[PDB]
């Protein structure tokens, strides 16, 4: 019993993190087999980041300008290439600690764990969510670029995110491991508008189910609602519209707790309209939206990995 | 920038977790050199846990009743012994993945990371704090006993906690790795009163400093206070009394932000007396007390390990 914002065991990913240095810029890279992945702005200086011609900047470099550090191992660089916004450095040694992995482009509202790294050394591990506006609300100090987000399914690591940028608003943007940014952001130091961020409604509902499972009882009322009627209250408070697909996502949690999904929607409607009156739900005074329904089922069942 | 409840990289500890089976009970053990550490109630059945004579139960066992599983490695057990509330199983093979480690008895208000495990397989990683009443508010489903809490200082793992028990109130109790319980709890299935839990005042203040560092501005007022006058408001709201030692703990954070510690105390006094008016502080609508001042300095400086 009890419910925590729990991140994946980062051991599999710790063994892949390296240090990539190009000229006078040092960030993190990811070492999978004989390829190192890292943000392409490692080739930029501070002045370059305002309007960088990444192609032109890359011709000025050859393989021997990239110094890759895995602890104290020297990786020789035998080839380099740009794929969208990431660099792929061919190294002559396959990583002996490479786990089975996938590259996955995640959808908004999904969650993943972040291994914050600096100079190739792991610092901390925390969970976050891909906000509906494709940003993430993490902790990324100077030198954290190249840190990766991931999920684990038993023995396989699913890499979904690599950090690139701190927006001038304080939120964080990055790419998948094919180099494509999530959202409209570009690896350039300019004004970048982040769209309106809505609350992930299906995640809040799943977190309400985890509270009922763990004894938080007080917010279930005697009301019910319809999909279109709850969706009316949704846009009022900038919540994501609930679809039938979201209802079926919550199917298993509805089965165990015996509370119909639309009845849980009525409890959410009353929480949005009436506030929380100073009470808490799983140690929280807000409505939490960083738990996917798959996250709730995992913690409430003891699913492990390896 | 940004501030997260961040746990240590659990790779060093993942390589020490094993599965310990005695009769029909299966929990987790910790494999350091040629010794496996695990809770002593692995030798109990469900009926035994109400009034177990652990000594008498241990004579009925010999070395070949303990089946230790590290992934698919079979560890032979060549000796067993009780130290307080933990079992020490001598195995004939030293763990090749043993990091440098210490056993540490932590003080209340300190924080550590928890690697939740089931049947010897890591499930998740999260940070928590030793509450002033020596409980912890974690997530421990059935089969999580033996999971350990730890801190990392560069290359050395400081083991401080191993989980033993879920109280009938839903909170969690356990021991240090010498087998001594934190608090008055006993590995027995009975009514166990948990004392009044106060809020860790020095941790809330340090979390207020991290908010100022990261732009949360609104709660700093034009008031100041004294130690005894703030301590008056402390016991009203069940906060820990602040001592001069706590003030000096916050010294470095007072130096960087330029806000005197007692001025931050005045801001806390106004937050306790006036509520929060519906605003947030680092994405939180309550006053967070699970961040030690050493935790704040780490995240705000980029301290890494290995």
Author numbering:
A (entry chain A), B (entry chain A): 1 to 306
Article, verbatim:
Crystal structures of 11 Mpro mutants provided structural insight into their altered functionality. We employed crystallographic structural analysis together with a high fidelity FRET activity assay by our group to assess the functional and structural changes in Mpro mutants. The crystal structures of several variants revealed the changes in side chains orientations of residues in the active site comprising substrate binding pockets, especially S2 and S4, which might lead to altered amino acids preferences. Accordingly, changes in KM values for most of variants were observed, indicating alterations in a mode of substrate binding. We observe the highest level of conformational plasticity around the S2′ and S3′ binding pockets with N142 and S46 being the most flexible residues within the structures we solved. Also, we observed that the charge distribution in the active site changes quite dramatically even upon a single substitution especially around the S3′ and S2 binding pockets. This might explain why with most mutants we see the changes in binding affinities and not the kcat values.
